[PDB]
Symmetry: none
Subunit: 44 residues, 8 copies
């Protein structure tokens, strides 16, 4: 795993994960990952 | 296991991970994510 | 390894982990992430 | 490893971890995490 | 004689007049133009 | 007049008037132009 | 003759008027001009 | 005869009148000109 990425943009608005609830009961997020190369995840 | 991330950008906004609510009851966020290479996790 | 994180950006903002409520009952934000390379975690 | 993190950005702000409540019951935030390489963590 | 020029461009490379001579023997230029309203020029 | 010029541009390059020459034997440039409203010029 | 010049730009470069030669034998740059709301020039 | 000039820029260069020669004979370079309201000029 010898990656190089994350290069030039000359712009950008990144937002990832955004959890907006309203007049509700519940939310459960478990987000994991944006760029991987060798993931051996057990039980996320 | 090398890594070259976050190169030239010339601008850039990142709101990462947010959370908003209004009049709710429950929220839960278990975020474990961005650019990874090798994650041998147990039980994230 | 021979990892290089962070290079030239020539501007940049970041809000990271924001967390708003209004008249909730509960919020629970449990972030455990950014740019990683090895996470052999047990039970985040 | 060699792990030559960080570089000059020629501008930049950061907000990191915020929190705002309004007329709520209360909130809870168990955050921990940022730019990191080898994390053999046990329970957060 | 109201105007509103030079509004939003969000990038731009203007050049106007680039008089270039290469292995010539003469050149004459008399550029007298852009956004106008009321020119009464008695030469040019 | 009741002019307005030069609103937002968010980047911008001009070269106005250049005059590059090589191996030539003459040149004349008489530029009298940008954004005008009322010009009563005589004998430019 | 209200001349609202140059509102907010948020960047911008200007190379104005320029004059290069190489192995030439004359250049004669006679510029007079930019943003105008009156010019009654006699014999530029 | 109002004139406002030079509002917000947040970066910027200016080069104005430049001149480079190589083995010329002359560069009779007679520049005028800027952001101007009322010119009644006689001979230049």
């Amino acid at each position: 795993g010898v990656l190089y990425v994350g290069s030039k943009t000359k712009e950008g608005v990144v937002h990832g994960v955004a959890t907006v609830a309203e007049k509700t009961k519940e939310q459960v997020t478990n987000v994991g990952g944006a760029v991987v190369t060798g993931v051996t995840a057990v039980a996320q």
